[PDB]
XYZ file of N, CA and C in Angstrom:
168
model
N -116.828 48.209 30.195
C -117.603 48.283 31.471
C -117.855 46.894 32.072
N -117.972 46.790 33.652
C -118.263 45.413 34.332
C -119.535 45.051 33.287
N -119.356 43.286 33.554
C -120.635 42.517 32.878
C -122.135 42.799 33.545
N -121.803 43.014 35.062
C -122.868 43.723 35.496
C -124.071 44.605 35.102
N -123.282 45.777 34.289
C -123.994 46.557 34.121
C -124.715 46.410 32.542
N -124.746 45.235 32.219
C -125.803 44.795 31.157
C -126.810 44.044 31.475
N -127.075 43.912 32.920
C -128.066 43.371 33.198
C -129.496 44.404 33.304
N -130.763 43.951 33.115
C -131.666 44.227 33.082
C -131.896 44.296 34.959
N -132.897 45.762 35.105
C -133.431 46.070 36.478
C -134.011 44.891 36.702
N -133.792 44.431 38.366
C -134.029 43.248 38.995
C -135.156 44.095 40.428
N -136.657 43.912 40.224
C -137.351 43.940 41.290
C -137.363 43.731 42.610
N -137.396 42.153 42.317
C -137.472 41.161 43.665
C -138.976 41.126 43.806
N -138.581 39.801 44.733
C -140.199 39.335 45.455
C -140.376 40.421 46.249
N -139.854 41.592 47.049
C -140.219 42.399 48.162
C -141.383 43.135 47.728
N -142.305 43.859 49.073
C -143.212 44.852 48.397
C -143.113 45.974 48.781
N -141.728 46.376 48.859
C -141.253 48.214 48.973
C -141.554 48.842 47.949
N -141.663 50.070 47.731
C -141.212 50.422 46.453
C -140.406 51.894 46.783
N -139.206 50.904 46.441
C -138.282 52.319 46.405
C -137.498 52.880 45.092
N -136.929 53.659 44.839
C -136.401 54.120 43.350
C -135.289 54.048 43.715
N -135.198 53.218 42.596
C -133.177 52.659 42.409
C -133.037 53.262 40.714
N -131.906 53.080 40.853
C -131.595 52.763 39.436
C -130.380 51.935 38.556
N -130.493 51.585 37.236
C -129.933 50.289 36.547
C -129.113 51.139 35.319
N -127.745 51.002 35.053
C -127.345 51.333 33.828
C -128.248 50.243 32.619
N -128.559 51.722 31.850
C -129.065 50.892 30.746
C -127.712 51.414 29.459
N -127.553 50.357 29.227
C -126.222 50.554 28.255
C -126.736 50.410 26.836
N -127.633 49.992 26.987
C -128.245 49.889 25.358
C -128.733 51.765 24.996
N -128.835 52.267 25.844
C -129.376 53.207 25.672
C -128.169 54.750 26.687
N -127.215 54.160 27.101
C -126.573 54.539 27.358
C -126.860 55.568 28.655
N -127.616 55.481 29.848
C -128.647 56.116 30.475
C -128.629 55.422 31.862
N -128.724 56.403 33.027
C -129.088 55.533 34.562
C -130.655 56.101 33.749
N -130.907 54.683 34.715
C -132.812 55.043 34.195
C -133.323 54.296 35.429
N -134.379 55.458 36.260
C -135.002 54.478 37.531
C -135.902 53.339 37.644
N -136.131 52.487 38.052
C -136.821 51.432 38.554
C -137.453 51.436 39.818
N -138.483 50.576 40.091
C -138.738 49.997 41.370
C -138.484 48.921 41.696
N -137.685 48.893 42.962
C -137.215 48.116 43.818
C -138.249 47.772 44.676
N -138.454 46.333 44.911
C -139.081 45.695 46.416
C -138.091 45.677 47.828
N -137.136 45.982 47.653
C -136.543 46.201 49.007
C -135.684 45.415 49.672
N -135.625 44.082 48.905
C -134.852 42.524 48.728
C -134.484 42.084 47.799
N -133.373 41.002 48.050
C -132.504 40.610 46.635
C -132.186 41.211 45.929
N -131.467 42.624 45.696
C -131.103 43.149 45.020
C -130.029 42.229 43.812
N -129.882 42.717 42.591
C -128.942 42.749 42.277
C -127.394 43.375 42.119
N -126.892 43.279 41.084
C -125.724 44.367 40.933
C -125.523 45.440 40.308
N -126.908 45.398 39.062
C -126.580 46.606 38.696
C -128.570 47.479 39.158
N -128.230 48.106 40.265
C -129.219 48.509 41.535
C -128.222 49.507 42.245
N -129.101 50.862 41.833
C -127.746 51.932 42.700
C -128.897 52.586 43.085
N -128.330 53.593 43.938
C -129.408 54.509 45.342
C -129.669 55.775 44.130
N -128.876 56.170 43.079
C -128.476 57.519 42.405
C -128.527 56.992 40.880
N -128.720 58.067 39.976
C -128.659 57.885 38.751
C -126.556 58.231 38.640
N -126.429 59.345 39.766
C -124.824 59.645 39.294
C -124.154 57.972 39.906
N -124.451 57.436 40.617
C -123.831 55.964 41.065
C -123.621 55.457 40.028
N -124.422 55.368 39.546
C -124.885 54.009 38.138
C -124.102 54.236 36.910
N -124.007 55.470 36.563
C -122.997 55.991 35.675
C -122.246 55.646 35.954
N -121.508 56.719 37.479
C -120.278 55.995 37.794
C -119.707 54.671 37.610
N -120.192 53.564 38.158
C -119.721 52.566 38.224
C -119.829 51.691 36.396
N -120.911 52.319 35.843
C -120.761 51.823 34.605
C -120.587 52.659 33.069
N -120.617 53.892 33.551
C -120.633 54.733 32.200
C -119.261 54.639 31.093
């Protein structure tokens, strides 16, 4: 899988809170987060099926 998707959910300084979600590969799982709404990173998807996708 991309190196991406071993990164840990990335917040940001923003104060949205919207639900994203982060492959967690340690655990093998899209798992949601809150997002501030800025600076995203790369592994930050709209869907738990995205996040798989791109990293399962």
């Amino acid at each position: 899988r991309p190196a991406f998707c071993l990164e840990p959910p990335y917040a940001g300084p923003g104060k949205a809170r919207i639900i994203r979600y982060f492959y967690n590969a340690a655990a093998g799982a899209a798992q949601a987060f809150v997002y501030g709404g800025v600076r995203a990173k790369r592994n930050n998807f709209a869907s738990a099926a995205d996040a798989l996708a791109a990293c399962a």
